Amino acid sequence: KLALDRMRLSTALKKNLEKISRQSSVLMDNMKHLLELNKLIMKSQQESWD
Amino acid sequence: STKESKNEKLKEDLEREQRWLDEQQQIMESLNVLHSELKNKSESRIFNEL
């Protein structure tokens, strides 16, 4: 069930890529926040490894 | 936030463990030296002492 739902979401999101780039959304702010958080998370993970 | 807290605790524990390791190395070296010195080194003598 999860795989089917993920594939459906993936194709439905790929079909409308340019609309989420021209006038996209506050989703762009959400994406930039996620992009800012992921790098710090990975750096902390590497430090913990060492 | 949780990863940051984990990293801080890890650094503190690292410092404490380093200090403990140094002290334990000193103690073990002293104990080995004492054992070596001890290993390196009859009522007549008791009566003569008295």
UniProtKB/Swiss-Prot annotation, chain A:
It is found in: Nucleus; Chromosome, Centromere, Kinetochore. Belongs to the CENP-H/MCM16 family. Component of the CENPA-NAC (nucleosome-associated) complex, a complex that plays a central role in assembly of kinetochore proteins, mitotic progression and chromosome segregation. The CENPA-NAC complex recruits the CENPA-CAD (nucleosome distal) complex and may be involved in incorporation of newly synthesized CENPA into centromeres. Required for chromosome congression and efficiently align the chromosomes on a metaphase plate. Self-associates. Component of the CENPA-NAC complex, at least composed of CENPA, CENPC, CENPH, CENPM, CENPN, CENPT and CENPU. The CENPA-NAC complex interacts with the CENPA-CAD complex, composed of CENPI, CENPK, CENPL, CENPO, CENPP, CENPQ, CENPR and CENPS. Interacts directly with CENPK. Interacts with KIF2C and NDC80. Interacts with TRIM36. This is Centromere protein H. It comes from Homo sapiens.
Swiss-Prot record, chain B:
Residues 1-41 form a coiled coil. It comes from the Eukaryota. It is found in: Nucleus; Chromosome, Centromere; Chromosome, Centromere, Kinetochore. Disulfide bonds: none annotated. Detected in several fetal organs with highest levels in fetal liver. In adults, it is weakly expressed in lung and placenta. Component of the CENPA-CAD complex, composed of CENPI, CENPK, CENPL, CENPO, CENPP, CENPQ, CENPR and CENPS. The CENPA-CAD complex interacts with the CENPA-NAC complex, at least composed of CENPA, CENPC, CENPH, CENPM, CENPN, CENPT and CENPU. Interacts directly with CENPH. It is linked to Chromosomal aberrations involving CENPK are a cause of acute leukemias. Translocation t(5;11)(q12;q23) with KMT2A/MLL1. Belongs to the CENP-K/MCM22 family. Component of the CENPA-CAD (nucleosome distal) complex, a complex recruited to centromeres which is involved in assembly of kinetochore proteins, mitotic progression and chromosome segregation. May be involved in incorporation of newly synthesized CENPA into centromeres via its interaction with the CENPA-NAC complex. Acts in coordination with KNL1 to recruit the NDC80 complex to the outer kinetochore. This is Centromere protein K. The gene is CENPK.
